[PDB]
């Protein structure tokens, strides 16, 4: 796992994308590269002991939909260091960095069944007061909750599920 190696590259890509007003294009460029990193044949090439320069060129070729600034430079710098397998994480960090500057939070909600869209809009407006961000809810229908909802806002979590209260009671005894 290489969160720690991806942090510098994600920060550099993002801090460059705001100097050139193209965060939105960079995100999809990195998403394309992150997908090419997963192919079964390309993953065989990335493991072999090719020279960084020719291995970078063998990676540029499969992605022509890239800027001069973005692919032909970032991919080469990551190849010199042998970091290309880190691309799937350089993407996520990038997304995260963006959500920080844009003052956004990807709050996740979990429930036994769909919410009434009055409950859900109240949740949105209430979390935006709990936090200091524009929230973007996405729901999940997990049956083991049975009733109530779990609200996860990163590392913070609020558990209102009947199963959580049941198994808390089981330890009150």
């Amino acid at each position: 796992e290489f969160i720690t190696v991806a942090r510098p590259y994600a920060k550099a890509a993002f801090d460059f994308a705001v100097e050139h007003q193209s965060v939105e294009r960079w995100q999809d460029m990195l998403a394309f590269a992150a997908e090419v990193t997963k192919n079964e044949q390309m993953a065989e090439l990335l493991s072999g002991a090719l020279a960084p320069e020719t291995l970078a060129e063998s990676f540029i070729a499969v992605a022509g939909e890239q800027l001069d600034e973005n692919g032909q430079n970032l991919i080469r710098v990551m190849a010199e260091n042998g970091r290309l397998n880190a691309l799937p994480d350089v993407l996520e960090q990038f997304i995260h960095l963006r959500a920080v500057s844009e003052a956004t939070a990807e709050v996740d909600v979990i429930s036994a069944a769909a919410l009434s869209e009055q409950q859900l809009a109240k949740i949105s407006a209430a979390m935006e007061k709990r936090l200091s961000r524009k929230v973007k809810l996405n729901a999940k229908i997990d049956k083991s909750v049975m009733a109530g909802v779990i609200i996860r806002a990163g590392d913070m979590v609020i558990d209102g599920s009947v199963r959580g209260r049941l198994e808390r009671l089981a330890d009150v005894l």
Partner: protein, 105 residues
């Protein structure tokens, strides 16, 4: 043919095309300033990189110098011709007399 990419004291790293990487005891040559320095390759790393030991003073070496691939190991004069004389590690004469008259190396 190849280029220096590192210099750590006595050891030097040289990059070659992967179709021309030297063997593991061949000699290489570098123009160190105005002198001529011989490297003996000790290891073949991946990517076409090769680790060598410098048969001479390593100071003055830039990274990025061009190096010449001699395709034979270090070879020294031998036989009757080498009797009353002092020689370098590279088989070069080190007394102030003329060249060695060997027929075989």
């Amino acid at each position: 043919t190849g280029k220096i990419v590192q210099v750590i004291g006595a050891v030097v790293d040289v990059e070659f095309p992967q179709d021309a990487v030297p063997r593991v005891y061949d000699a290489l040559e570098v123009q160190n300033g105005n002198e001529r320095l011989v490297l003996e390759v000790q290891q073949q790393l991946g990517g076409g990189i090769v680790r060598t030991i410098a048969m001479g003073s390593s100071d003055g070496l830039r990274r990025g110098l061009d190096v010449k691939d001699l395709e034979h190991p270090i070879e020294v004069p031998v036989g009757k011709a080498t009797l009353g004389r002092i020689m370098n590690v590279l088989g070069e004469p080190v007394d102030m007399k003329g060249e060695i008259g060997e027929e075989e190396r």
